[PDB]
């Protein structure tokens, strides 16, 4: 494993906001991208495997990692839309060409296929893992996540995320089988250090989830993604996990029915990155391999 990050973190104004990320290499882009509540950090492992298959590139979502907070912060900010124009912004400003590979995870697939569905022509290839591939039901649902994800999605979600920092704290390492070291628990807790909006981005998220319904804009978003996902062409890398969390039952029914997939399984709950860092960084670079042979 390992504690250090990747690269050097590099930075760019984005609407009027400084975002960090990273690119290290040449070559067609390699892009990394992280969900709640964790940053380009969540890469450091399997990064390194694809040295040399391309540019490796993985940005901090705004209010996350080393990107600036958006203030003034509150309820209705950092909802899908608000990542979305930034992240759209920042991948436009880094000129990632015409032939990407996207490698996401959680919130980062949300964007990334809304990204892809609406960027197809510059796709590649995307590998995936504990996504959001679809809208889903609260019986689809982690069972022993369920009440404590509907509470983050009433008016008591502010106190615990926001005051006690639950989600960073607790559902993180929650959902990561072996010990995180005293430095790793570091740095993903470093952008919420302090009590308050400084933390909204890992409530907002959540609260974001197309779960029987709600939110409308963000459910049609996912409904319009995994339609076309379903059909599409394009390569694909579908890295399950045992036991998984968010892609098992229904989902991962659903995500294995994907065009032109190639998959293989994991050990891991959720941010199974920190659980099989080599497995994810061999099954990606050899991925990239077929992709881009000499
Ligand atoms: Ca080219
Ligand atoms: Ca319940
Ligand atoms: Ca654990
Ligand atoms: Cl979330």
């Known amino acids: 494993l390992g504690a250090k990050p990747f690269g050097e ?33 969540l890469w450091r492992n399997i990064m390194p495997h ?3 298959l391309g540019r490796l590139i993985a940005c901090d979502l705004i209010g996350m990692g080393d990107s600036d907070k958006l203030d003034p912060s509150g309820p209705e900010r950092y909802a899908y839309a608000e990542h979305r124009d930034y992240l759209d912004a920042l991948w436009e400003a880094l000129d990632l060409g015409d032939r990407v590979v996207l490698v996401v995870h959680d919130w980062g697939s949300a964007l990334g296929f809304d990204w892809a569905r609406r960027h197809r022509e510059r796709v590649q290839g995307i590998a995936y893992m504990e996504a959001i591939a679809m809208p889903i ?16 999605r009433s008016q008591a979600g502010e106190e615990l995320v926001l005051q006690d920092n639950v989600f960073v704290e607790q559902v993180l390492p929650g959902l990561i ?31 974001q989830i197309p779960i029987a319904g709600t ?18 062409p394009i390569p694909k890398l579908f890295i399950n996990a045992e036991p ?39 099954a990606i670079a050899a991925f990239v391999r077929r992709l881009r042979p000499a």
């Open 50 to 52: 694809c040295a040399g």
């Open 137 to 152: 039901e609260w019986a689809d649902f982690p069972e022993q996540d369920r009440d404590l994800f509907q509470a983050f």
């Open 215 to 232: 939110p409308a804009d963000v459910v049609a978003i996912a409904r319009d993604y995994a339609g076309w996902l379903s059909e599409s």
């Open 177 to 207: 089988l072996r010990p995180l070291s005293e430095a790793e628990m570091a740095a993903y807790r470093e952008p919420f250090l302090a009590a308050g909006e400084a933390r909204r981005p890992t409530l907002s998220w959540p609260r």
């Open 9 to 41: 973190k590099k930075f760019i104004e984005i609407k009027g906001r400084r975002m960090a990320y990273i690119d290290e290499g040449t070559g067609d882009p390699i892009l990394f991208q992280h969900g709640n509540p964790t940053s380009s950090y």
């Open 244 to 282: 998984g969390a968010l892609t098992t039952g229904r989902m991962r029914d659903f995500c294995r029915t994907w065009p032109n997939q190639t998959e293989i399984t994991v050990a891991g709950a959720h941010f199974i990155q920190e659980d099989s860092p080599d497995e994810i960084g061999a």
